[PDB]
Amino acid sequence: EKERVAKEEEEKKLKEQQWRETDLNGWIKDKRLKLNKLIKRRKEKLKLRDEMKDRKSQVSQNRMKNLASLAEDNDEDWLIYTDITQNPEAFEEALEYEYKDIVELERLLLEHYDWRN
Amino acid sequence: AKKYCDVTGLKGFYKSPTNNIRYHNAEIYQLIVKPMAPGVDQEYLKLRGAN
Amino acid sequence: DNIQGITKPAIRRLARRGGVKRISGLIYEETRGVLKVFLENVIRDAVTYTEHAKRKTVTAMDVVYALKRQGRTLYGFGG
Amino acid sequence: DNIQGITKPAIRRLARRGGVKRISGLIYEETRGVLKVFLENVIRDAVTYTEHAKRKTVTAMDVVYALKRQGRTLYGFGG
Amino acid sequence: PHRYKPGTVALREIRRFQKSTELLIRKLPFQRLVREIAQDFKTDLRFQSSAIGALQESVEAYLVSLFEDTNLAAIHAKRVTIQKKDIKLARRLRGER
Amino acid sequence: PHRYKPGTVALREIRRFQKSTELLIRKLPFQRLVREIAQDFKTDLRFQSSAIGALQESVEAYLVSLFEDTNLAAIHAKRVTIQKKDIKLARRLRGER
Amino acid sequence: KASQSRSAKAGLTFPVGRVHRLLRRGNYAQRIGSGAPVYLTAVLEYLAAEILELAGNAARDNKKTRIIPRHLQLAIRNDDELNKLLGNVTIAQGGVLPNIHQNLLPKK
Amino acid sequence: LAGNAARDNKKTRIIPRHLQLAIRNDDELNKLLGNVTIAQGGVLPNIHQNLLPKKS
């Protein structure tokens, strides 16, 4: 099972190498678009993480209302109670994984904030 | 008397309502004025004698 | 039947207030034991505040001061 | 690199004071993260006592009073 | 008929008890217990109902906090059912011996 | 070709440090650490010599008091080796969060 | 000649003079300065106002018009600096916040 | 108590390790000072039975 997955990964790497050797500009554009999408998703996640720290924000009021509704009360309700938990360390791990994915997209683009203002 | 920003010395348009420190624009407020250590606001106000 | 004046589902009620799932049968007398070693430390301090005050009844005041002592303070009855 | 001042055989020395036969390798940085919050929590209440004393040096007199305020009153250096 | 999985209606009972704010110990066995436990230190001792409520609220908070401490020590020990050594560990690591 | 069993000399040096009571923490790196952690609030800080010794004794006592607790958590976990999860449960049961 | 109290001189609704009385014959110090009850009164103002804000939002969150001690308990325990300040005090008739461990759920 | 803890370890001088030995053995004194850290006293030697190796 692991050997078949390794052979599939090697075949995918060979297909990516053949696509880079055949159409380098199209693969570079696709990898740049993927890097831009990953950067936009990471920026949205960072904006959400910054907005969650504010106690007077409307997201904090919505979290308080969700906690009051969960106290007020189903598989969906149990899933919402599981997903309404605080996960700062998991947020940092997800940010690290998103940074690793963005670095992989940047490496795929390579293979295929300023101080003025 | 003319009003100046306490951090940079430029033209101070605004003034924070918490520690009464004048600032120039948003980046100064976000980086310097709001997350400032306690006791430094009085030393800033010591320069123009407003402590 | 005084120390077992509390009943078998009473520890169950205090258990399911605590978010537990499965409960054994040998823990009921042990929870009653920590009841004994908690209420000795509470009402010995309460009766010291009682007969210091030249009274032979406990009021609402000495009990919450006894609770104020060890750091397990309780509101609502402070007046 | 100054945060690398505390050394791993010193953490081993502290561990064998506790009497532990087997130490895994992550315990060192775990105790580092534990201790870093911990000493800063008394540096919090030492330098404000120093500042209210109109002093710019710390001593053995305010640090023992900071520990006595939080709740680990320590003997040996007065107080 | 239709039954329930053991451990699913117990979730409903858990959420019912963690919504409901009511008192979980009957007042007369508790007042008998505190009267016969106050008789040892001093005789002819009368009581107050507000003192009864304060005492019962204190011990109810104490079993509650001790009980999630025991539950956390139990799931720490890769189990679901709690036992007596979980209680002894919770008391020893909480500081009261 | 005399090779000791692993853990026997660990227990022997555990015994030697059980009669021992001296400081197990180097002085100058800890002085550097407390200066770099105290510089962040009001600079140009003078320090007395006895304050560093008091800080040494308090950090060593807190370390050994946490380590006995996590030893009890580990021996309750049916293991000999400690982990981060024992340290978190020790911090949870002692209550410093 | 007639002038009003120091509370509206400082713009506060809590009694400055009563706090001064309690600081005087509370035997904390043999001499009490003038500005101490004003500062202490303002601190109690902000603490009571913030607690009443969280209680009012909790009572709005349950669609009621009265302050139940459940609202006070959930407002104190939900918020984290009020958790650290009020960790060792048990609120009379407060209850317990709902929490289930993730491994205790029917994960399947 | 410190004098007895001095004579059982052959010394005529009081050291803080002897003071720690004198406070920790008496249980009522121990919970009297359950929140007190001593300086240069050490900890009592306790070795766990599961951590003790071999058999008999």
Add this chain to the structure above:
Amino acid sequence: RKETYSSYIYKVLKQTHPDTGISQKSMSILNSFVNDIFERIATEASKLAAYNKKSTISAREIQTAVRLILPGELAKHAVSEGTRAVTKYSSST
């Protein structure tokens, strides 16, 4: 004759929530809370004044006690409110 804070805190609630009612037990909890906070702050200030060999309690030792007791952002908001109140009161000229 007995003392309570009830009218003041009632007014504080009417300033922000006009249509909200009150349980008497809630006043008992909140009266105990404000008395307990006044208790810890006042003896922290007295302890600090006894430390500095001073016989006088002023605004600065209770400022340091507020910095000692309260968490950091509550400490900074509390000293902001206290400083603006004491500077408003000190402008009796």
Add this chain to the structure above:
DNA sequence: TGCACAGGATGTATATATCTGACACGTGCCTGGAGACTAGGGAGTAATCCCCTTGGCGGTTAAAACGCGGGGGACAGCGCGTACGTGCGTTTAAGCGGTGCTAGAGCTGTCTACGACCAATTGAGCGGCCTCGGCACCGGGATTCTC
């Protein structure tokens, strides 16, 4: 034998009508906070002395970093049984609530003797200085777990 239609039964919908039920506002009152006047002593300023502590030397040396062989300890996995959850029959003694009785909480009055306050006094406990032996340190031989 099954299905469709018709008739009866019942739910309900929304404004009533009585009709309590627990809340927020309009008058006394009394006592304690505020204004005004006096005193004295507690921070406040500041200068000066001296002491310790922050850098900077340098040697040297226990001790940490690093790499390497090996061995039990933690990891998941699988089976055996029983203990806790579920359920219905059968108590029982909690809860309400009602009444009767009386201790004891609580307020007031009055007194006088314990204690703050003040002035004089004498002695004893802090401190600089002086002197010497307990213990750590070092050297070398007996002795005990471990392999």
Add this chain to the structure above:
DNA sequence: GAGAATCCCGGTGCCGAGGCCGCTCAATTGGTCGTAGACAGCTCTAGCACCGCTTAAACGCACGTACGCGCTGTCCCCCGCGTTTTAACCGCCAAGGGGATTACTCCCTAG
């Protein structure tokens, strides 16, 4: 059965732990007065005791099934040990900056 690794007995400065005198404030004694603690005496709230109806909660027996527990095979990651090397520590000299303290003063807080 051997071997590191201990415990145990004897010589060595030493430097840090007991006396001792000088003496300076701080404990001691006496007198005065004005109030607070103690006791007596008083009025009613509130705590204890018991009877009786209702019934929802609690005990007890029966069984069924997940879950606590016993065993097992295995990576493998911690543990003992040799080899650099790198910073910790001890001896010390000098500065100067910061704490202690004296000394008058006035204002603001007690009454």
